[PDB]
Design an enzyme around this catalytic site. Structure first.
Site, short mmCIF file in Angstrom:
data_model
loop_
_atom_site.label_atom_id
_atom_site.label_comp_id
_atom_site.label_asym_id
_atom_site.label_seq_id
_atom_site.Cartn_x
_atom_site.Cartn_y
_atom_site.Cartn_z
N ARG A 96 0.80 -1.22 0.00
CA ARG A 96 0.00 0.00 0.00
C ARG A 96 0.83 1.28 0.00
NH1 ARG A 96 -3.08 -3.92 1.66
NH2 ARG A 96 -5.36 -3.76 1.60
N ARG A 102 -11.21 -8.91 1.69
CA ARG A 102 -12.40 -9.05 0.86
C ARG A 102 -13.16 -10.32 1.22
NH1 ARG A 102 -12.68 -10.14 -5.75
NH2 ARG A 102 -14.95 -9.90 -5.90
N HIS A 118 -8.08 -20.77 -15.84
CA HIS A 118 -9.23 -20.23 -15.13
C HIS A 118 -10.50 -20.80 -15.74
CE1 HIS A 118 -11.19 -16.50 -13.06
NE2 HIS A 118 -10.99 -17.48 -12.20
N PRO A 119 -11.39 -21.41 -14.95
CA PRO A 119 -12.59 -22.05 -15.52
C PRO A 119 -13.55 -21.01 -16.07
CG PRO A 119 -12.08 -22.90 -13.32
CD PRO A 119 -11.26 -21.66 -13.50
N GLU A 171 -20.04 -23.70 -13.70
CA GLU A 171 -19.78 -23.21 -15.05
C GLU A 171 -20.77 -23.78 -16.05
OE1 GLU A 171 -17.65 -20.90 -15.75
OE2 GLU A 171 -16.97 -20.77 -13.66
N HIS A 197 -23.81 -21.68 -16.07
CA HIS A 197 -23.65 -20.55 -16.99
C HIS A 197 -24.07 -20.95 -18.40
CE1 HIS A 197 -21.94 -17.56 -14.35
NE2 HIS A 197 -20.98 -18.37 -13.94
N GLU A 224 -24.03 -14.82 -12.40
CA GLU A 224 -23.23 -15.52 -11.41
C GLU A 224 -24.09 -16.13 -10.31
OE1 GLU A 224 -20.19 -15.31 -12.60
OE2 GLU A 224 -19.56 -16.94 -11.29
N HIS A 282 -10.22 -4.44 -8.65
CA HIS A 282 -11.45 -3.91 -9.23
C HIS A 282 -11.48 -2.39 -9.24
CE1 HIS A 282 -12.22 -8.05 -8.15
NE2 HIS A 282 -13.35 -8.05 -8.84
ZN LIG Z 1 -19.19 -18.09 -12.88
#
Ligand SMILES: [Zn+2]
Ligand SMILES: *[C@@H]1O[C@H](CO)[C@@H](O)[C@H](O)[C@H]1NC(C)=O
Ligand SMILES: *[C@@H]1O[C@H](CO)[C@@H](O)[C@H](O)[C@H]1NC(C)=O
Ligand SMILES: *[C@@H]1O[C@H](CO)[C@@H](O)[C@H](O)[C@H]1NC(C)=O
Ligand SMILES: *[C@@H]1O[C@H](CO)[C@@H](O)[C@H](O)[C@H]1NC(C)=O
Ligand SMILES: *[C@@H]1O[C@H](CO)[C@@H](O)[C@H](O)[C@H]1NC(C)=O
Ligand SMILES: *[C@@H]1O[C@H](CO)[C@@H](O)[C@H](O)[C@H]1NC(C)=O
Lengths: 596, 195
Positions: A151, A255, A327-328, A357, A360, A384, A487
């Site tokens: 930081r 987070r 990454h799936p 997934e 999705h 999601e 983000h």
């Molecule tokens: Zn997903």
């Protein structure tokens, strides 16, 4: 001919043109993500440029049909999505600088490295270097070093850039007739012209904050329990009445609180349910995992996978020389092409990721008949939430026993059940105060309610009050700690993880109720219930053609986001925590800090 | 025993685009309908005004063999009383159609990894097609009210498009070859009979 009919014909030409051109970009993107060469990066970027240039040309053409003269709402939806000027409403001079900062901060986050005291030759990036410490190290000072160094050496680099980022984004937002860039982000949930289903951008703040008030009792008792356990581990650094130090929360920013399960597990003598051994026992493989997931969706009435899914998907790591992004992801290339990219190992984790997934894909297949511009979730949080509810049902001991991965004579006791919910709350519930507080700070900064010379003071004031988290080291306005998260410095909305979290449990309760589930919510499995699948399908096929309030009503029977189902899910944990904290302090003092 | 030239029709190297569909006259030959099934389960064989089982013991006049290429979802439009971009603008069968519609997936022949851009179809038109009408005009379609002046522009579209066949496409977008036989039943001196 009217202007409405002209727009229908224009969107007709666009719909055909877009489907071919988007397919090339999807295929070129797929070839890179499955075969990492330099040649494929060129092919991917070139297709991405042709697609981006195409949208810009059609964005200009669509603007020659004024929205105020179109009565068919579906056409207005497609035109409004295509007419989005975006950051092209600025001058070509200010537009070039905004990209210069967005691409600069992205470089700083991804390539910023920190070196230890008394060891410059060696240096650690965020991934995997510093994230490894913040997730696995149990030492106070080593975690504090990684937390503060990230930081103060990388976060400070971003501080001047974020200020310019706020000025240009606000200018871009106001030129497109939004109050601020935060108002622009809240436009995802806006609905106009449908009686009973409308939704204003400002109403999102009211709904989020009203719902978050009802989360506070659960989070406070979870916070109280975590602090009491962490105080045992770190006796000399943690107050029984104060906020939790920010560098002891399981990752770089707190987070998620997932990695605190090792120190906060209530009953460490009762093992977790990990069918990974049983899948190895029966010599399962990646095809079997996805074949079992296919059977699950068929069990509720949804269709089976297309033969092109089996032929064209990459369901195993190709290993050898062929490198691939592991990454799936679930791909919807269009024109009937549906794929999943996943370096699947035979683990219970990957087993549930397959159901996620693949969920999705079912959403993607459901709204395939829609026009091109309407093929997406109802709002940003819908897609999601559909994925998460599949791993909810597929992981229950009920479902695992039914498929022969769990012994039929398996007795569940309330101790292993509390252990599971505590793990769930550390991830699902822990992020909610973090998520709401972060987007609240960004909302107020974009609104102007927080001046530049008080950015970091208000940031840590809100961390103390809302999240119950206190900085271990005082930070002046040379820092930019929000920018230390991906983000923020990479310019993405963050409230989606709050809304989707609430959406997924409204979905599960409504589906489990249709499946006539008797008992606590978390044990429910919607398998073999075609009634539940039909209720889900009635929303999935909508896509973006209808307001998300209507789409949510087709599942849960209500027109607005609701937090009671989320509390219902964690009720057995809530009542357990309240008895667990009967001799503990609940709440926190905002003026205690570890740095005296 | 002149065996009707169905080999020319079904096993031709290249088919026509649906907008410029082909038409072949068949006369003075013996029409053996027992050896069309020599296709990888050829998906569609539907007859109207007649029954397929009797086909190879009848006698007809005015026999025509129409052939083109469409995608899987558009096959359902090759039938009486159907609408859609293919039925409206490319190939239209009358309400009282008498004949047989034969179609099969041709992914192995008419698809390409980089995309097959051989086959076309019409996207815009002033009005629907009359039955068995063919229009191969490349005139610029006017969607607005100012004249398009024969130039592609705003509210001014090229009427045709390409099918862009790739083998990784779903079944609905994969190429299907279609043959549509048209005959008049039991009429006049009977040019085409078969077994
Ligand atoms: Zn997903
Ligand atoms: C990966 O791409 C290269 C060209 O960049 C090609 O030569 C190679 O065969 C590809 N690998 C596979 C498995 O297709
Ligand atoms: C909007 O247009 C579509 C297609 O043009 C049509 O199917 C639909 O009925 C129309 N809706 C209204 C409310 O006019
Ligand atoms: C899906 O199920 C249908 C019958 O419901 C069957 O005809 C089809 O072959 C199946 N496809 C796959 C890929 O299993
Ligand atoms: C669904 O039905 C099948 C039918 O035999 C059964 O084997 C399976 O256990 C059932 N699943 C659930 C969750 O009841
Ligand atoms: C489990 O349930 C029984 C209910 O009679 C209770 O006595 C026991 O204390 C419970 N244990 C936990 C860990 O919840
Ligand atoms: C087309 O060729 C195949 C062999 O390749 C044959 O069996 C079939 O009968 C032929 N079709 C016609 C209509 O003659």
């Amino acid at each position: 001919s009217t202007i409405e009919e002209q727009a229908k014909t224009f969107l007709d030409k666009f719909n055909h043109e877009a489907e071919d051109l988007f397919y090339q970009s999807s295929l070129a993107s797929w070839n890179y993500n499955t075969n990492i060469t330099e040649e494929n990066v060129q092919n991917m970027n070139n297709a991405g440029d042709k697609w981006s240039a195409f949208l810009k040309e059609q964005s200009t053409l669509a603007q020659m049909y004024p929205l105020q003269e179109i009565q068919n709402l579906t056409v207005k939806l497609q035109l409004q999505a295509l007419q989005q000027n975006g950051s092209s409403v600025l001058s070509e001079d200010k537009s070039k600088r905004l990209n210069t900062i967005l691409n600069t901060m992205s470089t700083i986050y991804s390539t910023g490295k920190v070196c230890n005291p008394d060891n410059p030759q060696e240096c650690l990036l965020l991934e995997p270097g510093l994230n490894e410490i913040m997730a696995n190290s149990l030492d106070y000072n080593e975690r504090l070093w990684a937390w503060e160094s990230w930081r103060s050496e990388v976060g400070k680099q971003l501080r001047p850039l974020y200020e310019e980022y706020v000025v240009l984004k606000n200018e871009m937002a106001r030129a497109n007739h939004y109050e601020d860039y935060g108002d622009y982000w809240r436009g995802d949930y806006e609905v106009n012209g449908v009686d009973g289903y409308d939704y204003s951008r400002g109403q999102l703040i009211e709904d989020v904050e009203h719902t978050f008030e009802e989360i506070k009792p659960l989070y406070e008792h979870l916070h109280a329990y975590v602090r009491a356990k962490l105080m045992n581990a770190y006796p000399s650094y943690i107050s029984p009445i104060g906020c939790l130090p920010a560098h002891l929360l399981g990752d770089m920013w707190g987070r998620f609180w997932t990695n605190l399960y090792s120190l906060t597990v209530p009953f460490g003598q009762k093992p977790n349910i990990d069918v990974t051994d049983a899948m190895v026992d029966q010599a399962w493989d990646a095809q079997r995992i996805f074949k079992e997931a296919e059977k699950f969706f068929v069990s509720v009435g949804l269709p089976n996978m297309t033969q092109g899914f089996w032929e064209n998907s990459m369901l195993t790591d190709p290993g050898n020389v062929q490198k691939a992004v592991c990454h799936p992801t679930a791909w919807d290339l269009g024109k009937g092409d549906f794929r999943i990219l996943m370096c699947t190992k035979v683990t219970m984790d990957d087993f549930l990721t397959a159901h996620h997934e693949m969920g999705h894909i079912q959403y993607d297949m459901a709204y395939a008949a829609q026009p091109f511009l309407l093929r997406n979730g109802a709002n940003e949080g819908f897609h999601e939430a559909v994925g998460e509810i599949m791993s909810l049902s597929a992981a229950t001991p009920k479902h695992l026993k039914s498929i022969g991965l769990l012994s039929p004579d398996f007795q569940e006791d309330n101790e292993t059940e509390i252990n599971f919910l505590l793990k769930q709350a550390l991830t699902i519930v822990g992020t909610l105060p973090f998520t709401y507080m972060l987007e609240k700070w960004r909302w107020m900064v974009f609104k102007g309610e927080i001046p530049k010379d008080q950015w970091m003071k208000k940031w840590w004031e809100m961390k103390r009050e809302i999240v119950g988290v206190v900085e271990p080291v005082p930070h002046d306005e040379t820092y930019c700690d929000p920018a230390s998260l991906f983000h923020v410095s990479n310019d993405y909305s963050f409230i989606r993880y709050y809304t989707r979290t609430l959406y997924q449990f409204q979905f599960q309760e409504a589906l489990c109720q249709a499946a006539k589930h008797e008992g606590p919510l978390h044990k429910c499995d919607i398998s073999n219930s075609t009634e539940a699948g039909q209720k889900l399908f009635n929303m999935l096929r909508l896509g973006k053609s209808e307001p998300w309030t209507l789409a949510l009503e087709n599942v849960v029977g209500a027109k607005n986001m609701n937090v009671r189902p989320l509390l219902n899910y964690f009720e057995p944990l809530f009542t357990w925590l309240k008895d667990q904290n009967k001799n503990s302090f609940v709440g926190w003092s905002t003026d205690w800090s570890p740095y005296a | 025993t002149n065996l009707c030239p169905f080999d020319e029709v079904f096993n031709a190297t290249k088919f026509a685009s649906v907008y410029a569909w082909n038409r072949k006259r068949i006369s003075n030959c013996v029409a053996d309908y027992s050896v069309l099934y020599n296709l990888a389960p050829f998906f569609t064989f539907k007859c109207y005004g007649v029954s397929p089982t009797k086909l190879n013991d009848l006698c007809f006049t005015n026999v025509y063999a129409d052939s083109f290429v469409i995608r899987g979802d558009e096959v359902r439009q090759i039938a009486p009383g159907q609408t859609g971009n293919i039925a409206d603008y490319n190939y239209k069968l009358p309400d009282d159609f008498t004949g047989c519609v034969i179609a099969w997936n041709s992914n192995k022949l008419d698809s390409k990894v980089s995309g097959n851009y051989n086959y076309l179809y019409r996207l815009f038109r002033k009005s629907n097609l009359k039955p068995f009408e063919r229009d191969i005009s490349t005139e610029i379609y006017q969607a607005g009210n100012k004249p398009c002046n024969g130039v592609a522009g705003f509210n001014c579209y090229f009427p045709l498009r390409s099918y862009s066949f790739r083998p990784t496409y779903g079944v609905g977008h994969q190429p299907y070859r279609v043959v549509v036989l048209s005959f008049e039943l039991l009429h006049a001196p009977a040019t085409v009979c078969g077994p």
